[PDB]
From a paper:
The voltage-gated potassium channel AKT1 is responsible for primary K+ uptake in Arabidopsis roots. AKT1 is functionally activated through phosphorylation and negatively regulated by a potassium channel α-subunit AtKC1. AKT1 is the first characterized hyperpolarization-activated voltage-dependent K+ channel in Arabidopsis thaliana, which belongs to the Shaker K+ channel family. Each subunit can be divided into four parts: the transmembrane segments comprising S1–S6 and the pore loop; the C-linker which contains the helices A’B’C’D’; and the CNBD.
Strikingly, Asp379Ala was identified to be a constitutively-active mutant, which could mediate K+ currents without CIPK23 and CBL1. The Asp379Ala mutant was then purified to homogeneity for structural study. The constriction of inner gate narrows to 0.76 Å, indicating a closed gate. The “straight” helix B’C’ of the C-linkers from Mol I/I’ break into two short helices (B’ and C’ helices).
Numbering used by the authors:
A (entry chain D), B (entry chain A), C (entry chain B), D (entry chain C): 49 to 510
The structure:
Amino acid sequence: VVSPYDHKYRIWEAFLVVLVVYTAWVSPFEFGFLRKPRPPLSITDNIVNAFFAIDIIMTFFVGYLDKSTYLIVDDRKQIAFKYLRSWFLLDLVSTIPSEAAMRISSQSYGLFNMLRLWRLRRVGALFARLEKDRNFNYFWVRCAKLVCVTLFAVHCAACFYYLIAARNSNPAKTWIGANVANFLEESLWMRYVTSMYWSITTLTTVGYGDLHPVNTKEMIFDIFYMLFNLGLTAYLIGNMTNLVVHGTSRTRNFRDTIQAASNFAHRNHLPPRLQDQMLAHLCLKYRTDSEGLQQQETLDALPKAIRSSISHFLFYSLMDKVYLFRGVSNALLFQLVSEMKAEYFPPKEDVILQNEAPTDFYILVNGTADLVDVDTGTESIVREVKAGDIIGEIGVLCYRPQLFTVRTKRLCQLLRMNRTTFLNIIQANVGDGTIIMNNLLQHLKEMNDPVMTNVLLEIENM
Amino acid sequence: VVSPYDHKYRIWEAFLVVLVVYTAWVSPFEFGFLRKPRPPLSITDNIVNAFFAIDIIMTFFVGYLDKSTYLIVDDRKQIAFKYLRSWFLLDLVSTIPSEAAMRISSQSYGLFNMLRLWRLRRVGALFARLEKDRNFNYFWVRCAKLVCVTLFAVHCAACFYYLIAARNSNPAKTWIGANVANFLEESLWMRYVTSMYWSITTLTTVGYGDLHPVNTKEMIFDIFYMLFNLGLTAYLIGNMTNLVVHGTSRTRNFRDTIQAASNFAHRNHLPPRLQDQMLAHLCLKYRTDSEGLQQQETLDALPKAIRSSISHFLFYSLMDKVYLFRGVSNALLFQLVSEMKAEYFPPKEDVILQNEAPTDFYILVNGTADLVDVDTGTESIVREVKAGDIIGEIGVLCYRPQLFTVRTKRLCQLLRMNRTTFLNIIQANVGDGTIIMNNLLQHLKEMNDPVMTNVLLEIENM
Amino acid sequence: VVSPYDHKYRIWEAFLVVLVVYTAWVSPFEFGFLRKPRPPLSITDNIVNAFFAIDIIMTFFVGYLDKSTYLIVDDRKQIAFKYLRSWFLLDLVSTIPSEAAMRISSQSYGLFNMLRLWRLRRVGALFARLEKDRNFNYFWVRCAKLVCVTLFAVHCAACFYYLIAARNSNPAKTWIGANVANFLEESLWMRYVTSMYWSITTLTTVGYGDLHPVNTKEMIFDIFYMLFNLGLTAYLIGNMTNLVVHGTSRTRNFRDTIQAASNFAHRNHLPPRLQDQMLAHLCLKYRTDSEGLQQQETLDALPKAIRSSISHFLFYSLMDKVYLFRGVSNALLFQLVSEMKAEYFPPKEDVILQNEAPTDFYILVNGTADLVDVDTGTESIVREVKAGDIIGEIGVLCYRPQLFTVRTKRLCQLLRMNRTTFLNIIQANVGDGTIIMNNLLQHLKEMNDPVMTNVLLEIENM
Amino acid sequence: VVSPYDHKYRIWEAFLVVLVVYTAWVSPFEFGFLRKPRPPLSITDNIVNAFFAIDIIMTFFVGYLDKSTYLIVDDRKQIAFKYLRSWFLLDLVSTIPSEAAMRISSQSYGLFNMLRLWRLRRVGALFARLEKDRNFNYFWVRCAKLVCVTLFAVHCAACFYYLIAARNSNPAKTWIGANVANFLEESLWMRYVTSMYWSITTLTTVGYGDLHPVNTKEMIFDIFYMLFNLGLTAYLIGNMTNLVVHGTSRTRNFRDTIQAASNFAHRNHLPPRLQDQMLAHLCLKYRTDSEGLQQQETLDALPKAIRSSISHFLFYSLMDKVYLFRGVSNALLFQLVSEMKAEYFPPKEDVILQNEAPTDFYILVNGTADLVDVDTGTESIVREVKAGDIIGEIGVLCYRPQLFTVRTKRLCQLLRMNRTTFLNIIQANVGDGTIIMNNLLQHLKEMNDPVMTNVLLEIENM
């Protein structure tokens, strides 16, 4: 019994697609270039016939994945009936050797050799898989699919066109017979290289003009091949345009955003400190790829029982190490952890201005900042904060404008919390506002500062 | 009076467009290769003209979808006024046979045969109709339109360039007279194949170099035809590029989403159960085409009197089979059914965590989940729920944090109901939360558990 | 002062761009094909120089629309300062006749004739203006710009390459002397046609291979011209791709929406009346181009002082001619008019379901609809409403759920008013709720209906 | 220690990329066209190798910007470990002169010279830098990168194909020996020009047909080179298409908006004053490039501690120069300044209608507007307001419909302020509402709208 997702089974898959690439080269070559068996190739041909014999002896069962349950179905019957519904005679007769066919019909040599190209469904499913896969980048996958179909079309056309040249009385006034007088006397590698040269030169529309059609059957095949090439080249340029437009869109929108904001700052004559705070923020929003750019861009599309657990993994020790949440509850901790906004901040940037409306408070993870107070125009720092300290809580828990300006003097990470979101959580778990006010004003009674807020809040209650 | 949207009438339209394809090949061929009528085509010309005369009779009773009413005007007068004011004269004069034209003037055979190309308006209307259809895929419709206009332009150019070769004294020092010494003695099929070969080799810009202009009239025509081909080839690449970019947008955005989120999970070093819950949800959000991905993309655009009846069709027996809604009303059932959000979930995923904020409850359709409680790290299941049961209703009807973690274990389907949305509904039908509390607390006393929720319930009531 | 936006002045501009097209042909032809003045062109050159001297006089009194005021500046000095600082010297030296140039030196004929290509700034400004216009579609504007730059590049390269063939001792063993040895005896039109034929054949990359370079200077020019052609062809395909991708996007997204919703309805097995109600609404949302589709899509971006007066112009007679607003106010009329949502509806579609939540009510503009009441599965129509009547108000002015079901039976236009939006307006102009209730309960006892609310709300009032 | 962001060091970078452009031309030319050392290039080779040896010495002490801190590491050890672990061996071996190679082996001259192309990492990093830079436009950066890779690939193929021509017995029956009889007896410049002509003619797919392959090794190289040119040509067209679609998107969406609004206004038969108010506003919403269009397009994405200071810089003198804010507070001024939405208005446009809902009020920055009042259909101005004065405050501070209609008459700039946003600020700073009412009614009593405003307004108050 063999199930998928098996590392003994994917070896078998990759070995089969290598044999498919073998057949993709060989079957047109036998169709267009060979009448006789020529055992220097035909021995290897019968050998890979034996490989496909042991292949079809092995292939009778493997489990699959059904939809609407997404479970693995392996039950030792229906596992071979389903596989023998569709193509069993095809790859069955695909293994009959050429000696058998010449014993049957000694004119359908290459005609029966051509039949083996059902095997290319493996390559099709492989490319569908790799597009569905997330390990290999989309660029090289689409590029490889294009080069495979291009080389296959070139090879098939060179084989068919040499077939048209050979299967003709009067070898002169054929397309190879027009300039090369005696090509049946020259080698097989030479004739294949000349036919592939013709096919490449025709497909890419270079067309030097040696090796051109002379009679009518060559003209008809060349008309349909050039219509095919026109469609194929349009398909290639379309895929390459898609592939470039996807690949350079993020940098494009980033540059347009930067250009618009810097153009705004110049026509309004902003101070340059404000100007490069703007550009520092808008630059750091970009190159935090999969830290803070993809964070709010992908965590939004999660069903909120997942990103609550993501927030519980990344930030839960930090909410046990802040003074305002000492012994409040355990339900309140998970709920406050579940609704933070982890944000980055480049160095030398104010994150709370003085006399703001009270709306947010922040909790550091890393980096440092300074509390900056102004008196009559001179900026004086007050107190540097450390990674793990809450800032902005004075006035948000109250209803007062903010007291100090907070400038991140290094690269930092803060956790924003909106005020009405903070209150709507602590309107629930009633009686826990008491412990929040208690471990606030027992922290405000500390620090030995000239407490004007402490005397104002006690009258503010009653 | 024949109506449109009719199965007897569409067959007549399709037979007409088959005759239009006939005329599109034959008329440039007559203009380029023929002087006589040559009755082996004149008979078929008069047959096709007879069918077009039958259709120009038949069109006097066929209704039309008029705008501003979107009804069908079918009244045997003003249904001919619209026809005679639009294009009656041109498909009148397209129907006239050519023996009358040679009876008038023995010069205007080809110039009158070229006038039958007014019939291509049917092809244009057909392609517009097929692009407006939802049955035939847009890809091959655009591909068919491009190949038809390409083949028609190649055919017209081949016939015109052969005409420039023909109506010229000294057949030598023409383009076919340059290499083929005696082309007037060789057959008509040979000359048509050679002109198609020239026109293809020029349009695809292969240009082998034989069959080139040698005098000035051929150079002028070839200049204008190469300019037309430049515009046409750019048009084909533009259409194929559009057709590729629209075809591979969904897979592209899905892959970018998966890449960004898996890139997020690696830098933050999440536990792998969390990591493949994330990837399982983001994968299942894709391949629910026309069940869940198209659901909240198309239902939101509907004017809410439609999606309410869609929700009434799919999920109305289910809300009669839950304990919490027994005999409340019939108005409340329709209102709650109207505002459920059906969502899919891959197996092995938490959908409600323990100690969450009480915001949602869910109703199964299919699949099962498990209530999971943690005490000291060890997590045991409590009560597996069945398809058709409600989870999360405790604490939403109350105001308490959630009690158990709900982990799915099959491909489930849940119906989310928001809390404030739920309370805004039961304020209407006021006095019918009495039955809700009644069949809650009577249900809470059915199973054996701590019924301390009834203790906090009654002190909260009175 | 001659103003812009002037019909006496635009005709002068159009005549000037006709003269610029003349110069763009003639100046490279004189540079490459001529040495003498040759009066059949010299007369016309001096005429065109006279017209450009007339315009370089006329440009001293013509107003300009400056920025930061968007007002026409007309001052007769500083209207010449702006002109002299911009391009007065270059179109001065473009205007000088060439007989003075041969008076200076008998070598600088063509090199001075090429300097007249400064006049193409008029063409550039013209194409910028026509892109900023809304009367000429963007498609053919971009197409005309592309064919102009392409024809001009072809023409200049043909002239330069004939010049390289001409200015050469041993005229044989040049590119034109390779096949036509006596090319200096054959006509000027013939040599211009063969040069244009070469130049088209190189630019399209057809490249027949006759008329190819034979010495080193021709090879160097041909390398640079083919690099230019590579860039130019990529530019042309890029413009045509932009022009196709924009032009086929609305139909594309409409088709994708139809495909997704019809796919959704199939796998959920909805009843077909529901299914074609969905398709009728989704179709009618599309083909109301600039009636209802562009209405919500463009009125949203307006600053709400404009669309209020748009709503006031379209629908103000209707709110006077409805019974519920008889003698209410005039401020409340303007405010309710300003916040309606005019919406179209296809025939055979329910717009309000029975037992809905009371959220909206509607007012007909045109079209007809029917009330539908059901009790035991039988749909009985109650009362057809006429174009200009309000439906849905019984329950929104009250708080009860809806009482009937309204199916549109023609192409209708309704005006939606949301309930919470309706109540926020009637708080202002207080006391007008009394007259709304008054002409509501006065309206219940109008037809002497078997009422079941007329006493049920007067007990709520009294 | 040397730092980046330094003008002594960037000049060294530019001089190195000049020497890289030198080596990119010279190394394939030596590989293809030279066997000898030939001191007229060998001297310059040793000079350029000396400069790269100076740079590989100099690079041990130059600071780098590490991630996760965005600071400059400068420590004189581990700043060399990073350099030794990245690419030290490759630009070591690129520096070695070729006389050492001919001391080793007198056949490995060009085979060693081709290894000097490791220096192109300088060019690649330069293009990455210039795309990330915001001073040079993205258009010509991508265009220059494309022409550099195109000319380099052409140059390499020309050198390799001449190498296949040269290293061959029987110089006749090569590709250059086919038409040129004795190419070894002709100049070096001639052979380089002919090889470059072949390589351009093959890459652009013109392909005249002279200079075509005649033996098998040339056919194999030409097959791989035409496949490469197919890939590169699709890549160039894709890049130019990306570049054009991004370059003309703003004008495209603007034109589509203008088209939809003008088409809406025509099918609904609006009065033309309303119609060109619509088009005036929608035009002005475009050509405020980085004044009003990019203003709310970029300030929205800012973390609101930045744009609060932007609003504080641009608009803070104005809030001290308005009568309603005389001595109110100092925190309230910063909060009100922080939440103003500045807009532009084209001339002759109503910005507030009479009998609107009281929702907004506006403060002029620059420009003049008028007040328009209707009596029975005749409208005239009442009072012109000048830049710096507030309009619409009467009735927003109250709860009354508006009193006048405010029409602009120049390019104006107003500051919108929402009513509920205004009240949610003045609920904070309590007691400052008293001074707002006080300096309103002292302004209302002074400004003689004669009696009925001050009297009826005080009836609401007391």
